[PDB]
Amino acid sequence: KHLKFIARTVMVQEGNVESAYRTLNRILTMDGLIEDIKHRRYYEKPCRRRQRESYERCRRIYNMEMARKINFLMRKNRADPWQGC
Amino acid sequence: TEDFIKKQIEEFNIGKRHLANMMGEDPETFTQEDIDRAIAYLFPSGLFEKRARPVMKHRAIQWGEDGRPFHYLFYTGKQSYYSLMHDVYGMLLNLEKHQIGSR
């Protein structure tokens, strides 16, 4: 019931149709539409969905914490200033 | 201890004098090479491993009778290596402050 050729529409730039398609695919991936399309092929039971969401939240939090720890400790990775001691 | 080593040194000197007497050599100029030649002649052993042949020749302890160690890095357990490293590091500090057939 909406107007056509406004949503999920990418204009090709100088005929690089491959590049335009890759840009549209990246947009869909970033907006999560691909995830929804593929996960709605089969019904995920609510308990399974809750378990998956909890696991994803835990994994994201753990990855962020590990990345922050690595970035914080990267400063120590300089050359040894007290070589021989 | 050092007392045992000193006793061994005195015993070696006395035995060297006896060996020089036996070989007829001058006890003064009776050097280590003369000692080795005399021992090889008097006790001819053909054992291939030269360490097993008869030999007449001249590790230590790192603290005195009071128990105080001589080296300030003794308690490291590797006082020689760490003293060498300390000296090298000091030389490197001095160089930094101031500024083939060998393997």
Side-chain angles (χ1 to χ4, degrees):
Chain A
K1 275 194 150 66
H2 283 60
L3 301 186
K4 321 282 182 163
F5 304 108
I6 303 179
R8 324 185 212 167
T9 302
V10 180
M11 286 297 301
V12 74
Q13 178 169 348
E14 307 151 44
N16 59 357
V17 298
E18 193 69 21
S19 178
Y21 180 87
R22 306 261 299 286
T23 298
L24 173 66
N25 206 352
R26 169 176 48 195
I27 292 169
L28 292 187
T29 296
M30 291 192 81
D31 280 6
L33 266 68
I34 304 299
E35 287 294 335
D36 287 326
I37 290 160
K38 289 205 310 308
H39 285 179
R40 287 170 192 281
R41 187 180 179 171
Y42 298 115
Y43 184 64
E44 185 168 39
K45 292 174 179 268
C47 64
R48 308 292 284 163
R49 182 175 172 156
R50 280 193 300 276
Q51 291 167 27
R52 176 170 61 75
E53 288 182 355
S54 162
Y55 168 85
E56 282 167 7
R57 284 161 192 140
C58 284
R59 193 184 60 165
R60 177 179 297 118
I61 286 165
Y62 176 78
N63 282 352
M64 281 180 70
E65 275 293 290
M66 192 79 159
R68 186 169 65 89
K69 175 179 176 181
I70 289 156
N71 292 336
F72 186 82
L73 301 178
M74 184 172 175
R75 258 194 167 73
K76 184 182 171 183
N77 203 37
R78 294 172 300 262
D80 178 21
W82 323 118
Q83 186 173 358
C85 282
Chain B
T1 183
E2 189 188 279
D3 171 62
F4 170 74
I5 303 302
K6 198 144 64 186
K7 184 180 289 184
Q8 292 310 127
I9 292 168
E10 301 310 318
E11 184 176 359
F12 164 81
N13 287 279
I14 295 149
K16 160 188 166 182
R17 287 170 78 192
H18 289 89
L19 185 56
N21 186 6
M22 292 166 45
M23 302 292 288
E25 298 269 352
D26 193 333
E28 313 306 321
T29 52
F30 194 67
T31 64
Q32 180 58 44
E33 307 309 314
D34 313 300
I35 283 157
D36 285 357
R37 194 195 319 105
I39 288 289
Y41 162 67
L42 289 173
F43 313 88
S45 185
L47 310 182
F48 300 133
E49 293 211 67
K50 189 165 63 181
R51 296 158 74 88
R53 286 176 191 166
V55 57
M56 195 173 88
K57 274 179 173 185
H58 181 254
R59 204 171 67 77
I61 182 161
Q62 309 92 295
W63 65 80
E65 276 59 33
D66 58 349
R68 286 194 62 94
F70 307 119
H71 207 315
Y72 70 108
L73 293 174
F74 164 71
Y75 290 99
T76 57
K78 293 154 71 167
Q79 54 173 47
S80 302
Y81 168 83
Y82 284 125
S83 185
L84 180 49
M85 287 266 284
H86 178 90
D87 304 336
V88 170
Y89 188 90
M91 290 198 297
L92 274 170
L93 294 174
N94 279 356
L95 288 170
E96 203 282 328
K97 204 206 78 63
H98 203 73
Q99 295 159 8
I100 49 170
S102 63
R103 61 153 179 78

